[PDB]
Design an enzyme around this catalytic site. Structure first.
Site, PDB file in Angstrom:
ATOM      1  N   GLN A  75       0.825  -1.205   0.000  1.00  0.00           N
ATOM      2  CA  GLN A  75       0.000   0.000   0.000  1.00  0.00           C
ATOM      3  C   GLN A  75       0.861   1.257   0.000  1.00  0.00           C
ATOM      4  O   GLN A  75       0.662   2.159  -0.821  1.00  0.00           O
ATOM      5  CB  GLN A  75      -0.940  -0.008   1.206  1.00  0.00           C
ATOM      6  CG  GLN A  75      -1.729   1.279   1.384  1.00  0.00           C
ATOM      7  CD  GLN A  75      -2.528   1.300   2.672  1.00  0.00           C
ATOM      8  OE1 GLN A  75      -2.605   0.301   3.387  1.00  0.00           O
ATOM      9  NE2 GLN A  75      -3.128   2.445   2.976  1.00  0.00           N
ATOM     10  N   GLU A  79      -4.106  -6.157  -2.038  1.00  0.00           N
ATOM     11  CA  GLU A  79      -5.257  -5.470  -1.476  1.00  0.00           C
ATOM     12  C   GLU A  79      -6.054  -4.823  -2.593  1.00  0.00           C
ATOM     13  O   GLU A  79      -5.513  -3.965  -3.309  1.00  0.00           O
ATOM     14  CB  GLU A  79      -4.814  -4.416  -0.466  1.00  0.00           C
ATOM     15  CG  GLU A  79      -5.961  -3.639   0.161  1.00  0.00           C
ATOM     16  CD  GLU A  79      -5.495  -2.675   1.235  1.00  0.00           C
ATOM     17  OE1 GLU A  79      -4.306  -2.734   1.614  1.00  0.00           O
ATOM     18  OE2 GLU A  79      -6.316  -1.857   1.700  1.00  0.00           O
ATOM     19  N   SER A  83       7.100  -1.009   2.069  1.00  0.00           N
ATOM     20  CA  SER A  83       7.183  -0.612   3.465  1.00  0.00           C
ATOM     21  C   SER A  83       7.306  -1.850   4.339  1.00  0.00           C
ATOM     22  O   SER A  83       6.812  -2.926   3.991  1.00  0.00           O
ATOM     23  CB  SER A  83       5.959   0.209   3.892  1.00  0.00           C
ATOM     24  OG  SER A  83       4.760  -0.384   3.424  1.00  0.00           O
ATOM     25  N   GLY A  97       3.396  -6.089   5.825  1.00  0.00           N
ATOM     26  CA  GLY A  97       4.114  -7.322   5.558  1.00  0.00           C
ATOM     27  C   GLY A  97       3.949  -7.823   4.137  1.00  0.00           C
ATOM     28  O   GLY A  97       4.849  -8.467   3.592  1.00  0.00           O
ATOM     29  N   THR A  98       2.799  -7.542   3.519  1.00  0.00           N
ATOM     30  CA  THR A  98       2.590  -7.944   2.131  1.00  0.00           C
ATOM     31  C   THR A  98       3.537  -7.197   1.199  1.00  0.00           C
ATOM     32  O   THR A  98       4.082  -7.783   0.255  1.00  0.00           O
ATOM     33  CB  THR A  98       1.135  -7.702   1.726  1.00  0.00           C
ATOM     34  OG1 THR A  98       0.269  -8.439   2.597  1.00  0.00           O
ATOM     35  CG2 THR A  98       0.895  -8.148   0.293  1.00  0.00           C
ATOM     36  N   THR A 107       2.608  -0.081  14.736  1.00  0.00           N
ATOM     37  CA  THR A 107       1.344  -0.084  14.008  1.00  0.00           C
ATOM     38  C   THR A 107       0.787  -1.491  13.832  1.00  0.00           C
ATOM     39  O   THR A 107      -0.426  -1.647  13.652  1.00  0.00           O
ATOM     40  CB  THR A 107       1.515   0.583  12.641  1.00  0.00           C
ATOM     41  OG1 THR A 107       0.291   0.492  11.904  1.00  0.00           O
ATOM     42  CG2 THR A 107       2.629  -0.093  11.852  1.00  0.00           C
ATOM     43  N   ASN A 159       9.447   7.050   9.491  1.00  0.00           N
ATOM     44  CA  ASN A 159       8.349   8.005   9.388  1.00  0.00           C
ATOM     45  C   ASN A 159       8.321   8.965  10.572  1.00  0.00           C
ATOM     46  O   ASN A 159       7.769  10.066  10.461  1.00  0.00           O
ATOM     47  CB  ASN A 159       7.018   7.266   9.273  1.00  0.00           C
ATOM     48  CG  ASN A 159       6.997   6.284   8.118  1.00  0.00           C
ATOM     49  OD1 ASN A 159       7.727   6.444   7.139  1.00  0.00           O
ATOM     50  ND2 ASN A 159       6.161   5.260   8.228  1.00  0.00           N
ATOM     51  N   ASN A 172       5.161  10.948   1.257  1.00  0.00           N
ATOM     52  CA  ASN A 172       5.385  10.412  -0.082  1.00  0.00           C
ATOM     53  C   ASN A 172       6.007  11.460  -0.996  1.00  0.00           C
ATOM     54  O   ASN A 172       6.841  11.134  -1.848  1.00  0.00           O
ATOM     55  CB  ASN A 172       4.070   9.904  -0.671  1.00  0.00           C
ATOM     56  CG  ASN A 172       3.454   8.793   0.155  1.00  0.00           C
ATOM     57  OD1 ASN A 172       4.155   8.052   0.843  1.00  0.00           O
ATOM     58  ND2 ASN A 172       2.133   8.675   0.092  1.00  0.00           N
ATOM     59  N   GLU A 226      27.714   3.231 -10.669  1.00  0.00           N
ATOM     60  CA  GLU A 226      28.798   3.924  -9.979  1.00  0.00           C
ATOM     61  C   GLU A 226      28.423   4.225  -8.536  1.00  0.00           C
ATOM     62  O   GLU A 226      29.273   4.156  -7.638  1.00  0.00           O
ATOM     63  CB  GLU A 226      29.166   5.209 -10.725  1.00  0.00           C
ATOM     64  CG  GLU A 226      29.877   6.291  -9.897  1.00  0.00           C
ATOM     65  CD  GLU A 226      31.233   5.884  -9.326  1.00  0.00           C
ATOM     66  OE1 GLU A 226      31.608   4.693  -9.381  1.00  0.00           O
ATOM     67  OE2 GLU A 226      31.939   6.779  -8.817  1.00  0.00           O
TER      68      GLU A 226
END
Lengths: 440, 427, 427
Positions: free
Chosen positions: A11, A72, A141, A145-146, A180, A207, A229, A255
């Site tokens: 996501q 998702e 991220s 976990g996905t 989270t 973050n 973002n 390089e």
């Protein structure tokens, strides 16, 4: 060989990539609709881009070659509502039928590779359409976990497929204070296991430090995920600017790989970018790049919960965009020699990898940071990440011994030996980073 | 053997060669469209030497520009005298070697070496009176320091009799940017000491100092430094091209400027380096130029005359100059600097005089020197190399490139042997 | 014997002959309506040689165009100089041979061979000074490879004294859409080696390479290739037609160019092959033309001088060229390639000079060679035939047609005998 393929996993990965293509088309003056708009206009063609990331069709349409993969369906609907889906191809975006698990126990399992095979042939078909490749780009991220699972597995699949191109994996690191999702310690340790298998370059961003900058520097009361973002879109556009625009010191992507990784194994360099100030403060301050270099060395402009002043200094990358003064960078390297604050080991001292870009930096109007004509990017290796991983390793060891989630993991198809191997790998990287640090 | 071939490569040598051609066409007089404008006959000889006569009185500069970027050739085409160029004279490749000497002359250089070698062979077939090859690149950039080194090695293997005049830009110690820059520089020079016979020490920090002390420029830009080095090259080539009391050849320098064939590094200096606007106060005389040549502020190596021991010197002059004045100046500088001037020469002197007046100046002067100070820079770069590869810092990528540490140790040993030879001959 | 007849067939030979006539008119000066525009008498001589003086000063070219398609004659009519043609000069049939040499020269050609032979007999009766027959076809397509072979055999049986110069387009090894193409080509050449006296090697892949390297074309177009072969044919025919220092006949080529009567193939090359836009930088000299001729990039066979062994060579020039310059170039190339030049000649030389200037160029050059690469191409096409008919793929077509595997083996044995004759005579 000049082309670059970017991958958007998870996501947060799609949200980061959407801001990346947003700032990209904004710099070259391209609208998010298409045709064109406009150009291929002085010098939006050669030198590429926009032809490395924006493939030009027969009619002149510059389509961004990006693969948005996420299990998702909500994220697939979000990227389809925007006008960039019209710019993208229906075959470029891979829709997710159902989420594997919450969030990594099944994403990295056989259910993940069922869709990875479909994406693998899509990459092969995309490689047959556009020949040449410079480096693999990843955006995901660790909180999701996905995203970390599908991103690490796809990274390993292409590494065994080609293994000749660089791999730039952007991984969003959660703050060590807030959790989270309690599965994150298991994912981050297992992600480090996947990097030990195959990893060329991984960018760690926190973050918490980014949100702290918007509150202090950008004067934002509540920093949103869009500002994060956009900031990541800014730091990645300046890095790839050495290949996009012209400059006196053009730095190759490979390089950057053969001038960053010293040891037989190290994959995690830190990134820092400056200046990041408010609009009113940018109108009130007119400092040169020398003050920007001095401020970029500070931990405030690191966008990560790591202190480069505490950890020992290693040879870094110092990229510049816009009007660059040779005397200023000579005065900049003069002051850092007179600083003598960070530990100057006997190997680095004469190292600040310079990248010169004649194109002035450009920021989105949504971002609170005003568009500046000068920017400095410091990408360094610091032993502070070893301390951060040790804390994550301590939390992971406590949860793993608590066996509250291991019962669900062995039911999903995990084993006790798999988690220990990831722990032994993470402990080895921390020991390796400490060993190469203590050799001073 | 009056014709001279010019080779340009690297991220900085391209602009160096562009400024060289600009200074040449400003010296003898020529339009960027190839139209002859010199007067009257010697300019046609200079054009036959450095240019090629095309149809309808056109003149194309004989230069081999090669680099791993189309932006470089585009930029040198956007220059004033950069428009007309034969598509065979310049060949540029893709995409980048990335500031690495090994990857520069192993992968990115090995794919385009055959094309440029065929080009230079066809040129030598068309250029009968070729004598030397002017190499213009930067030893700091690994791409250039690898490509130019490979080209010099291939030319030496092909034309061992032709001279090799290298104007490579040495890396600066103040530049703390890339630890791979001085390491690539020493790896390239470890081969250039055997592939090239005439190398000129040009430090970027020296250029910055000389433009900040004389021109008083806030931002040291490659433009004025390239202009200065191109004027120096034009002077040292017109010492033979333009008529004078005595013409100095590249072979004359090989048999007079260097005592033993192992030494190939020469420190250069130019005069007059007048301040901006102070030209009205400056009176172009011989004593002032003689004093400027023996000072560390006017040298582009840059060396200190008080530190090193002078092994040999040479001073060339252009314009209306008297032989008695320069003779008296040499006698004075030998009587006052007998400690620097070594005793086995015992009196080092090599003077060339050009009767023609320099472009825009009543008189100009160039100075070449060989002292015991280049070994100090060799020791500095060797210490940097040793302290930089004790942790395998940025080195495992080089091991995957194919190079071994034994070759690096042999290079360092050869540099130490050259230093000991420069200490024989002690400082 | 100055008049020459032209025969055109195949899917590409039609456009080849069209471009041939176009270039002939562009060379000597003539309108597509037959109006005389040359000056003054040599052009009328060329018109009496190649065209026909009709009523009201009209000029129609002596060409026999034949193909199994009305679209071909329609296209060569819609071409620029293609409007006026006597209905007896061209006869076209129906419908197709299916890219099969056997079917093409057994059924599709046997019904029109009588008509075309009557036409060529009437043309030979009307043309008193006929010397040679220039055949233009493509050996790739089976229909053309059969039709042209049958026509050449019939003309050889009728007038064995007249010379037979063929410009057949050899097939390309890259094209593999139809595996029967090289097999039809070798079956055609198995008879052409005895039915023809001179053949010129023209490969589609070689044409593609030369146009992509000189003209820099994105997609292979037959137009520029036909224009190039047209310029080559115009040069080799004006070597005798147009006045010069020495004229070379077809009989002269037959008695000076080939050592033994079994050999009939010749590899051709044209110069100058200048890039697009670089004509201002290019200077038309003799050394550059010699280098282009002796390099493999400008050959249309295409042969490699490093691989094959030079048995005999010839170089014809048009324009203001120096006999001393061409002699010096020949001596230098012989001294530098005595390994390629065979020793029993011992020095192969055949130079023709035309004083007239080429159309649009100051000087032009053609080159003919006989190396040991034609036998390698024969080996390649034989291996292709073997590997394609070992599995008996698409062989039912030919078994129904009537050709014999014993005949195929006899053709392969004759090709191997020619290979031994070209290796006698080692490489």
């Amino acid at each position: 060989m000049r082309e670059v393929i970017s991958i958007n996993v998870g996501q947060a990965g799609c949200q980061i990539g959407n801001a990346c293509w947003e700032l990209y088309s904004l710099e070259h003056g391209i609208k998010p609709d298409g045709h064109l708009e406009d150009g291929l206009s002085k010098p939006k063609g050669g030198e590429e881009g926009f032809s490395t990331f924006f493939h030009e069709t027969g009619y002149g349409k510059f389509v961004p070659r990006a693969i948005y993969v996420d299990l998702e369906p909500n994220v697939i609907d979000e990227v389809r509502n925007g006008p960039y889906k019209d710019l993208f191809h229906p075959e470029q975006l891979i829709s997710g039928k159902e989420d594997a698990a919450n969030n990594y126990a099944r994403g990295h399992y056989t259910v993940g590779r069922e869709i990875l095979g479909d994406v693998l042939d899509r990459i092969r078909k995309l490689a047959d359409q556009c020949d040449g490749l410079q480096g693999f780009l990843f955006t995901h991220s660790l909180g999701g976990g996905t995203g970390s699972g599908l991103g690490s597995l796809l990274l390993e699949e292409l590494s065994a497929e080609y293994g000749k191109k660089s791999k730039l994996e952007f991984a969003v690191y959660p703050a060590p204070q807030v959790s989270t999702s309690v599965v994150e310690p298991y994912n981050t340790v297992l992600t480090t296991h996947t990097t030990l298998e195959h990893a060329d370059c991984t960018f760690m961003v926190d973050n918490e430090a980014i949100y702290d900058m918007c509150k202090r520097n950008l004067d934002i009361p509540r920093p949103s995920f869009a500002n994060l973002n956009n900031l990541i879109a800014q730091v990645v556009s300046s890095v790839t600017a050495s290949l996009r625009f012209d400059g006196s010191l053009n730095v190759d992507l490979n390089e950057f790989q053969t001038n960053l990784v010293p040891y037989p194994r190290i994959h995690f360099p830190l990134v820092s970018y400056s200046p990041v100030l408010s609009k009113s403060k940018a109108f009130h301050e007119s400092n040169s790049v020398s003050e920007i270099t001095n401020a970029c060395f500070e931990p405030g402009n690191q966008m990560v919960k790591c202190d480069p002043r505490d950890g020992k200094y290693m040879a870094t990358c110092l990229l510049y965009r816009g009007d660059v003064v040779t005397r200023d960078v000579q005065r900049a390297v003069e002051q850092v020699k007179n600083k003598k604050t960070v530990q100057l080991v006997d190997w680095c001292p004469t190292g600040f990898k310079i990248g010169i870009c004649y194109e002035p930096p450009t920021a989105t109007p949504n971002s609170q940071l005003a568009t500046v004509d000068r920017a400095v990017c410091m990408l360094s290796n610091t032993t502070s990440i070893a301390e951060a991983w040790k804390r994550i390793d301590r939390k992971f060891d406590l949860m793993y011994a608590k066996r509250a989630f291991v019962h669900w993991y062995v039911g999903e198809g995990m084993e006790e030996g798999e988690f220990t191997e990831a722990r032994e790998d993470l402990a080895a990287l921390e020991r390796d980073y400490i060993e190469v640090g203590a050799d001073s | 053997m009056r014709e001279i071939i010019h080779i340009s490569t690297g991220q900085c040598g391209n602009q160096i060669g562009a400024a060289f051609w600009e200074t040449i066409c400003g010296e003898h007089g020529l339009d960027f469209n190839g139209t002859y404008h010199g007067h009257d006959d010697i300019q046609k000889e200079r054009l036959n030497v450095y240019f090629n006569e095309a149809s309808s009185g056109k003149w194309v500069p004989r230069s081999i520009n090669v680099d791993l970027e189309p932006g470089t050739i585009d930029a040198v085409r956007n220059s004033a005298i950069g428009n007309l160029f034969r598509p065979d004279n310049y060949i540029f490749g893709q995409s980048s070697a990335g500031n690495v000497w090994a990857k520069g002359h192993y992968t990115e250089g090995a794919e385009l070496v055959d094309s440029v070698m065929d080009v230079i062979r066809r040129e030598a077939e068309g250029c009968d009176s070729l004598q030397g090859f002017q190499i213009t690149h930067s030893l700091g950039g690994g791409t250039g320091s690898g490509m130019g080194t490979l080209l010099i090695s291939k030319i030496r293997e092909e034309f061992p009799d032709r001279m090799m005049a290298t104007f490579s830009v040495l890396p600066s110690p103040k530049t703390s940017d890339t630890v791979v820059e001085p390491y690539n520089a020493t790896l390239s020079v470890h081969q250039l000491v055997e592939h090239s016979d005439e190398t000129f020490c040009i430090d970027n920090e020296a250029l910055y100092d000389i433009c900040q002390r004389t021109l008083k420029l806030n931002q040291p830009s490659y433009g004025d430094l390239n202009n200065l080095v191109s004027s120096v090259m034009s002077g040292v080539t017109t010492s033979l091209r333009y008529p004078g009391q005595l013409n100095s050849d590249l072979r004359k320098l090989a048999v007079n400027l260097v005592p033993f064939p192992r030494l190939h590094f020469f420190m250069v200096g130019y005069a007059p380096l007048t301040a901006i606007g102070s030209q009205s106060f400056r009176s172009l005389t011989v004593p002032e130029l003689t004093q400027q040549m023996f000072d560390a502020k006017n040298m582009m190596a840059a060396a200190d005359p008080r530190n090193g021991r002078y092994l040999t010197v040479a001073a060339f002059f252009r314009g209306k100059v008297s032989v008695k004045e320069v003779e008296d100046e040499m006698h004075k500088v030998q009587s006052k600097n007998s400690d620097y001037f070594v005793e086995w020469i015992p009196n080092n002197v090599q003077t060339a005089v050009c009767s023609v007046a320099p472009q825009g100046l009543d008189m100009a002067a160039t100075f070449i020197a060989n002292s015991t100070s280049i070994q100090e820079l060799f020791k500095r770069v060797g210490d940097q190399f040793s302290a930089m590869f004790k942790r395998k810092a940025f080195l495992h990528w080089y091991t995957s490139e194919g190079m071994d540490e034994l070759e690096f140790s042999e290079a360092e040993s050869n540099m130490n042997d050259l230093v000991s030879e420069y200490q024989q001959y002690q400082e």
